[PDB]
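In this section we turn from sequence analysis to structure. A common task in structural bioinformatics is to predict how a protein folds when a small molecule is present, because the ligand can shape the pocket around it. The inputs are simple: the amino acid sequence and a SMILES string for the ligand, here magnesium ion. Study the lines below before reading on.
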Amino acid sequence: LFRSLVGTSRAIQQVRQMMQQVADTDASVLILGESGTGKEVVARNLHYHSKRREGPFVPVNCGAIPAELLESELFGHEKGAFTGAITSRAGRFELANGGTLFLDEIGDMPLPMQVKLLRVLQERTFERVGSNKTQNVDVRIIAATAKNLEKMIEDGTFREDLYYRLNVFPIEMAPLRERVEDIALLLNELISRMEHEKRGSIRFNSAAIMSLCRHDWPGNVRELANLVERLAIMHPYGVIGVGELPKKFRHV
Ligand SMILES: Nc1ncnc2c1ncn2[C@@H]1O[C@H](COP(=O)(O)OP(=O)(O)OP(O)(O)=S)[C@@H](O)[C@H]1O
Ligand SMILES: [Mg+2]
């Protein structure tokens, strides 16, 4: 199920080298890049080539989780912690023990939780909400952001100390529009997925590929994948020329 990073560009070949180097280590990894540039693919790949490969891979979607329950969600809770605690759950961190914790959009993590994350990176311990008992954790952190963390540091919306703790081995994902030589290969890979998964089939003629190579791709590879899916419904087992592209994708 593991995905590979497809592409021949300078930038993507560089990311593969960096991945191979850091994967087997226990260093924290910060992956930086726009939405849809492969940051989670990079993260999953790092994990399954790590010492922790058979351990759990636990995502944390920093922006989504209701702030009311953020600390509970991340660190678990004991009972009578808060209104309607009742049951019992452990948090994302405890669940990730012996594995990898993946902090998707770390730029959205609120300051109070940044302090607590810094404790885990530094003391490798934590306490469930309500309990002042201390638990050891054994996790490797991989974080990703589309934000400018150094701007945030300046704005005081991101902690400098967490930053230097997390940014031990940064990996930059170039946006699609800077890797346009990879677009054909990405197309083949995406079409191959869709075929292997009984979800239709298409192929692009050279003109249509030229047109796509001139596109800005604000949604990067996720936007590319979206377009392949739509075209396979609009023109099943068809060949996509310039004229079958939606007008926004035409650049001639
Ligand atoms: N180089 C690549 N080779 C193959 N598939 C890729 C590549 N880059 C991205 N993908 C795929 O395109 C999609 C992009 O997914 P992600 O890796 O999650 O993007 P992202 O950078 O994590 O953006 P967010 O934070 O989830 S909005 C996934 O379906 C990936 O499998
Ligand atoms: Mg993701």
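Residues 177-252 form a domain with the Helicase, Ruva Protein; domain 3 fold (CATH 1.10.8.60). As an exercise, try to locate the residues that line the magnesium ion site and compare them with your own expectations.
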